[PDB]
Amino acid sequence: KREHWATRLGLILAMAGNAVGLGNFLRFPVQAAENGGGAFMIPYIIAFLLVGIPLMWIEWAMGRYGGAQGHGTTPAIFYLLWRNRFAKILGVFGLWIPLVVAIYYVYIESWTLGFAIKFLVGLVPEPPPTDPDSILRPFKEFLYSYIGVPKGDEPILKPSLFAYIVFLITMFINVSILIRGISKGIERFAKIAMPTLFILAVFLVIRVFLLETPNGTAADGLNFLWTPDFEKLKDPGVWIAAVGQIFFTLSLGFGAIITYASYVRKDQDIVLSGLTAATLNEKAEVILGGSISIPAAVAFFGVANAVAIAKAGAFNLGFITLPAIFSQTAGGTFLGFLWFFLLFFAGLTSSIAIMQPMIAFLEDELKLSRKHAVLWTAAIVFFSAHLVMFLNKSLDEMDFWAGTIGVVFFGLTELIIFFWIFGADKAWEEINRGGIIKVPRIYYYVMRYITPAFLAVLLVVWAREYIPKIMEETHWTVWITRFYIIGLFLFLTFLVFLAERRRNHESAGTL
């Protein structure tokens, strides 16, 4: 019938690995530092309670429900919940979003492997022996030469040969896990990766906590991040950033939680399991991810400079600043290795999660073998990634449409289909069925009224005071990426159409 997670621990760690990734260690620090630190945290915590938790339960429920009938992806699941052809089309986003995100996420993940390798072997810049630019410049040049940032006017990137080869290796590693399946692949790997990730992260926090310079200490960083600023609570931008981060960090709206949950046995609890996966992610994000790069940057440069660093380049903090700071300490190159190794495992456990939806669709709906499903998915991602590797800003365009606005739109869509169309009481029943614990009574009202209203308002503000600038103030090359990803949606819709026909073909054979 269908693969199933072998153990409860395996399920929890696989789901935790799905969630805990580059978003916790790279994205969170930038969003927080960029939005006033503590001022960002209030909306963040509220978004977690009003959006993160409820949507997590909903996605687990939708996945388990679909899995019981042999379906793990939204084109089919949405249809099961709402037998309307439009359900299948909306469901395509559950394949498109994770695919598009994988197309750039796996490449960023590959940079962490490449950096881990170079730092391990000591092929790193030799900063000069205390002028900040003289210290940071060598590391900025290191990153820029790796990914091939434009030195001229052309919006073209020229990745180093090493970077390209490392992306290939990274794709191979993802495949090596996925090709073994759910219990012998993803689950087995999670039991090894998560413990390693936790240990590495705790160690790094401890080392960072020992940092002190004439400019400050790690403590100043924590105070910056954990001191409330009730005067920003009225800024939509902060709310948009906070909600966006919650979706991204919890893997919500990517169809990934849903697919993983489709392997949970029909009787199995999802209330406690889902809540645990969610809380584990938040601890890894605010306690671990929040305690590494920000405190380190603030300790060495002070708050004002740390904040300016993050705003200047989203990848500055994790790929340039932290390694530069580490280089000023004994054994700093090895500490850099540990940081990038941590990022790699965090990324790896998440990228396999966003490639599994396409794999599940090809297996469940087009009946391909796991081997063929995994290889074709890898081929599509590998090929498509060339756009992200060679066209400047393609990555940002994909991250916006699929990884930012896309997931919020899809989150609202799945909630409406499950809690409104399918039926609020049928949905509530499905969520709580088999639960080790019941979902708190108040959450019924949050899921049915609060969450959808919250997201609806957010999306309207996004499309009215932000999306116009992205459509009018960007370089013309953004249309190359938009064109390509719209094509991917077209192709995936064609596959759903073919799945429909095979099912009809197959039914007229069941007759």
Ligand SMILES: CN(C)CCCN1c2ccccc2CCc2ccccc21
């Ligand atoms: C703004 N351009 C340069 C980066 C956008 C993508 N990006 C983002 C997005 C917002 C804030 C920070 C970061 C950096 C880390 C990260 C990690 C994984 C996937 C995407 C991201």
Ligand SMILES: CN(C)CCCN1c2ccccc2CCc2ccccc21
């Ligand atoms: C100690 N041994 C069992 C772990 C190393 C193997 N391991 C790993 C670990 C890191 C990178 C790649 C891979 C290969 C594929 C893979 C698949 C399932 C379980 C573990 C792994």
Ligand SMILES: CCCCCCCCO[C@@H]1O[C@H](CO)[C@@H](O)[C@H](O)[C@H]1O
């Ligand atoms: C199958 C799809 C192929 C698309 C064309 C890919 C061309 C990649 O080309 C390779 O890029 C590397 C990184 O920039 C360079 O180091 C190599 O020398 C170059 O041959």
Ligand SMILES: CCCCCCCCO[C@@H]1O[C@H](CO)[C@@H](O)[C@H](O)[C@H]1O
């Ligand atoms: C993980 C092992 C990766 C090995 C590939 C390293 C690519 C780094 O650099 C490349 O190495 C090639 C052969 O040494 C040279 O011919 C290229 O000119 C050089 O740029």
Ligand SMILES: CCCCCCCCO[C@@H]1O[C@H](CO)[C@@H](O)[C@H](O)[C@H]1O
């Ligand atoms: C949209 C994605 C298009 C990918 C096409 C990539 C074509 C690669 O082009 C190659 O890149 C190498 C490294 O940058 C150069 O050294 C080669 O001279 C160049 O021909």
Ligand SMILES: CCCCCCCCO[C@@H]1O[C@H](CO)[C@@H](O)[C@H](O)[C@H]1O
């Ligand atoms: C979005 C895709 C960006 C691809 C960047 C490709 C850079 C390739 O390199 C270019 O290839 C041309 C034709 O092969 C040559 O005529 C140019 O001299 C060469 O620089």
Ligand SMILES: CCCCCCCCO[C@@H]1O[C@H](CO)[C@@H](O)[C@H](O)[C@H]1O
């Ligand atoms: C905005 C979302 C807030 C969620 C916090 C929920 C805290 C749980 O609250 C508890 O829920 C139980 C079950 O319904 C009740 O029996 C308890 O009386 C109630 O205090």
Ligand SMILES: CC(C)C[C@H](N)C(=O)O
């Ligand atoms: C797209 C998701 C799998 C990303 C993951 N939740 C992270 O925080 O990195």
Ligand code: NA
């Ligand atoms: Na996360």
Ligand code: NA
């Ligand atoms: Na992960």
